[PDB]
Amino acid sequence: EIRGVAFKELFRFADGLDYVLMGIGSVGAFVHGCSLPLFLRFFADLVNSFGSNSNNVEKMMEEVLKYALYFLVVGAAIWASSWAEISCWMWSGERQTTKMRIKYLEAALNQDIQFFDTEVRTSDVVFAINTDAVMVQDAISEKLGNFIHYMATFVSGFIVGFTAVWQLALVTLAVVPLIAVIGGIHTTTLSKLSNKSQESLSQAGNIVEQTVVQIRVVMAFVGESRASQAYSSALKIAQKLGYKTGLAKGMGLGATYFVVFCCYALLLWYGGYLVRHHLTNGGLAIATMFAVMIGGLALGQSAPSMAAFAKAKVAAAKIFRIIDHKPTIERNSESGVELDSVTGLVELKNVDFSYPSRPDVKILNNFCLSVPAGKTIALVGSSGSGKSTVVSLIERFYDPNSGQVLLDGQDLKTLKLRWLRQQIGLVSQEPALFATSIKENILLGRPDADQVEIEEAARVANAHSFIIKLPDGFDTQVGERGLQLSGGQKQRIAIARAMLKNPAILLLDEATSALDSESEKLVQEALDRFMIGRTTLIIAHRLSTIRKADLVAVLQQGSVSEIGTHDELFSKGENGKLAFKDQANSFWRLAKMNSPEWKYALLGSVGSVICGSLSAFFAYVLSAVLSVYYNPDHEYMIKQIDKYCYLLIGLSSAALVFNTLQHSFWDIVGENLTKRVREKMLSAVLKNEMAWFDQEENESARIAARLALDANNVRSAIGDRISVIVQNTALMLVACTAGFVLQWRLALVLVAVFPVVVAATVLQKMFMTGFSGDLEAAHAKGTQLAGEAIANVRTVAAFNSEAKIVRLYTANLEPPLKRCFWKGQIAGSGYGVAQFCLYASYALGLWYASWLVKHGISDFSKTIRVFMVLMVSANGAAETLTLAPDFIKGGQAMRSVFELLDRKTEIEPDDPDTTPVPDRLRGEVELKHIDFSYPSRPDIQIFRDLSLRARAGKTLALVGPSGCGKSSVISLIQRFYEPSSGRVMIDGKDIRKYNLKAIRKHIAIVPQEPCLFGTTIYENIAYGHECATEAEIIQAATLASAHKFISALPEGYKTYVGERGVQLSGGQKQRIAIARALVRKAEIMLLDEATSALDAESERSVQEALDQACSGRTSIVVAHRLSTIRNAHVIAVIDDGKVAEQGSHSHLLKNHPDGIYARMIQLQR
């Protein structure tokens, strides 16, 4: 484990402005922290004056006025301090982190390639840029300010409480730990249970992902229910964990309320005792209790900043480790001769390079390669030979071991590499394109070029292409949102960037196997014009360029064998605004969908209202006790205080019980709703046809992501919404009725500003969480550019364009900087305004209470009770709003799930219109005049009114060009896609009117790539038939010969096979797929060209298994390899969507000579 760097080093990249910002933010944070207990002290003074001066009205009025002015001053101070703190801390952190990001990327780019090979992985570098974008910035921007603020709040609260009433402060200090302890336990318990629920949800998502990637075989058979059952099990586990989560949350809230009620019972009694003995005032005691509570909670809230500091220390240690590293290979050297003879006569003698990470094995051991001066060389060394090692050595990526290696007669170390790499042009296996515009992606080959040179290079040496046939053209920033690039466009861009480096050698290598000939001919003309270009890593891919090269010296077993002529070369290298009515309707339909849980909801609802009442009740008690404090009759005050304390102790238990009840039952409602909706979504998805799966936004992990993300916000938007809207309604109703009954006038004035108080307290809690948004989302563009640069470090170094990448990174990072500055300003201003309005409302309400008392309208007791009850109830309501407010996201996901459910399938897997189905369908399939067009590409028509047919009980083999959709025929058979036109019949009955579900069990299919359903081979084989028992799969394995390795397998049938388990060989996987096909004992077998890339033993085994599989009943096979259709007695030709020759291969080979069969026979020779 790396040792975290000390805290001070985190501020390495701080300049003078950052120091000023940090100082101003620190002062603002200190003032913001201190001004809360100061407000409590001023409130105590105001209440004490307003209660003591009942007889002397004028003194009461003037003192209340001065303290209201103090409240306004404190509000203004809070406004200024919070604004300064938030803005300065956010912007300073962002600036420092951006500078450090830029320096990190700059240091990473100019590192040696061997650094990434051995020291730090590229994935580690990308993760490090994630960590520097998150943790270091978070610690030095928001966590530090919050730590200072909470230290200030803690110290100020303790000072205020002690200097007011040291006695009660000590008692309140002892009460603080209990509340803090319960809060910590509740938070930890929920986090642990949340982790359990999270992994359970991941399991459910994995099931959906697996089902979608295997949707073909799953739909081809009858696995739709099987998949739903597995999903049901995972959902059940998740809801059980959710039940625990909900019960734990309820218990935590109940426990903290119980402790709070009992502790304030004790504190209020002790405050009454102190008031009896003339040791304090009422307001002073109340403020002391509040201040000490605030200080303790502030320290508790400050601890997470320390946690963040530790994590960021570790992260910054890693980042500074990578930054401070110094490259070993010398760059910007002074030994460069800068020779103008760009032609490389001959070089690379006696190279003895050994791979840097592992010195045990060496490739370039003792041999020489040598080159001419202006003639290409083709290099073909086995398969895993060090063909790329020569390219790397030429580019000076590494260095040869102790020997004598030169270039052009002037060595490599004595020619620099800043301009040496300028002479050399490199084209990689896969072209490396960066997030900038394609125009700049042409520039970085030579920044000194102008527009005219770029366009002439792209035009005379490349054909007109998508760059000009484009809405944007030169300003076409690709990035992650790059347009459709099939490989040819980006490849041509890469060679163009290459030709901008006109002189000297140009290095080639193999491209993708499926590439158009235009790129190859452009490469050929590029190497012809730059005859200095040699060292093509063709690895036996273009015999024409091989004949072009004067020397085609090979690198067999990592060594040169023959150098010179290129004549025979045989037996070597044989490899080739949003609406609201719709939201209301969807809400109503989900509620109707949630009907079976109604009981729980009602009970939960009951608990909610009672919980709300308790909160209001608590507020009232405080008010009452305070109002009782300023009562001359001591015995009456004793009786009242005892009554209130006993009532509070009694109702603490009710608070606990009904908090647990409410949260448990609402969580049960929510979990049941999520499970039901998720199952319905999966069923609706599985009912859809394959054309729906082919469409975009509709495949693999992304559909699983939509399913996972559109259920939790649904549970929120139903359960949490109703729970809060009823509990806060009960709270507000009780508080408002108490306030009205006491003094309706002041109650009305206060409920005028009630939303302002609630909003301000909500913003206080949000400040507690933080106002910096998703830092990752802000720097997404820069992060992806940096990842592309680091992953493509070899290409960047080859084109010596590190500075260009750095400046592009800076230009991408500037808009996040500006956005962060403005966001900080807006957030600080808004928070300050809200707090100022809160304190202005407090001052106005309390002054109006004083004014009412002055004119004999009311009393001190009633007015103070109204004020305190309404304000504490506002705080409680805001604390209630802290529950997940994902309502808008909930509505959006509501619409998403509803449109997913209401989608209509064109092909219904079910058979509502039942048709007669024979028990043993013989299956005389006849695809007569079937006109089918590629679903993905309508223009492409694999079938053109082809009258294909196959007599039942007979084997038909489909042969023809790979381009024609011979496999697409089997898709039409399973009705995955419907032919653009034409009618297909299945044994005397058309399949359209026929029942698809009955057909599925009479059809067996083997995919070209076998797929792994689950853990055991047992279940994979049993998947073929609905009720496979045990003997049936035994015979399936024996006839399929799958048992041969199964007995050899340690666990046999029950071995864990798949991605994580024992990965069987391709032949074994295909053989078990064939076995599961035989399990279904279907009359019609649709054999696919699975035997594509296998070794000799696996080839023979899989063709044998195919021999037993196709034997018996009827089988439509598609094949392209000899000794496969020969066994079949009926062969068809798929030429251009039409049938050409029908009959046995031997029968049609004798007559009409030079036939299409003879064509592939001659080709296979």
Ligand SMILES: CC(C)[C@H](C)[C@@H](O)[C@H](O)[C@@H](C)[C@H]1CC[C@H]2[C@@H]3COC(=O)[C@H]4C[C@H](O)[C@H](O)C[C@]4(C)[C@H]3CC[C@]12C
């Ligand atoms: C005199 C008040 C009306 C004052 C003007 C008001 O603005 C102030 O913010 C009140 C509502 C605060 C000050 C201290 C707060 C309390 C702090 O002391 C406590 O024990 C905590 C524990 C726990 O966090 C409870 O959920 C809230 C609870 C019990 C708080 C409830 C709200 C307060 C009582």
